[PDB]
Amino acid sequence: PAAASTKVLYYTDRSLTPFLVNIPKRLGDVTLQDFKAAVDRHGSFRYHFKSLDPEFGTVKEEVFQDDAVIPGWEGKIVAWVEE
């Protein structure tokens, strides 16, 4: 009966070292607004997520809408947060 959880790694322009945070939701249910809340960083950002495209393989996909579902990579989320 354990609560849902997704491991989230994200890179910012400032740091060469990525940040690690956990979101209390199942991958597939996690939305951009969930991700933004975990990051909790004000400013004008773009958000790219590591994803598997069926034609091109590993890609970075951008997500715009707050209610939009975040793609995962090997059951986790790997993200780039760019100012």
Residue numbers in the entry: 355 to 437
Article excerpt on this structure:
Furthermore, Dvl, Ccd1, and Axin can directly interact with each other through their DIX domains which form the same head-to-tail structures. The mCcd1 and zCcd1 DIX domains have a ubiquitin-like fold with five β-strands and one short α-helix.
In contrast, the zCcd DIX domain is assembled into single-helical filament-like structures consisting of six or seven molecules per turn with a pitch of ~80 Å. The mCcd1 DIX domain was mainly eluted as a monomer with a molecular mass of 10 kDa, whereas the zCcd1 DIX domain was eluted as a dimer with an apparent molecular mass of 19.0 kDa with its monomer included as a minor state in the elution peak. Consistent with this, the accessible surface area in the homomeric head-to-tail interface of the zCcd1 dimer is 590.7 Å2. In addition, the interface of the zCcd1 dimer has two water-mediated hydrogen bonds. In Site 2 of zCcd1, Glu436 (strand β5) in the head-binding molecule have two characteristic electrostatic interactions with Arg368 and Arg395; however, no interaction is observed at the same position in the mCcd1 dimer. Moreover, the side chain of His402 (strand β3) in the head-binding molecule forms hydrogen bonds with Tyr364 via two water molecules. These results suggest that unique interactions observed in zCcd1 may contribute to stabilization of the single-helical polymer. On the other hand, Site 2 interface in zCcd1 was stabilized by two electrostatic interactions of Glu436 with Arg368 and Arg395 in the single-helical filament, despite residue conservation in loop β1-β2 of mCcd1. Phe397 of mCcd1, which is close to the contact surface with loop β1-β2, is replaced with Tyr365 in zCcd1, thereby changing the molecular surface from hydrophobic in mCcd1 to negatively charged in zCcd1. The substitution of Tyr365 with Phe in zCcd1 DIX decreased the apparent molecular weight of the mutant compared to the wild type molecule, making it comparable with that of mCcd1 DIX.
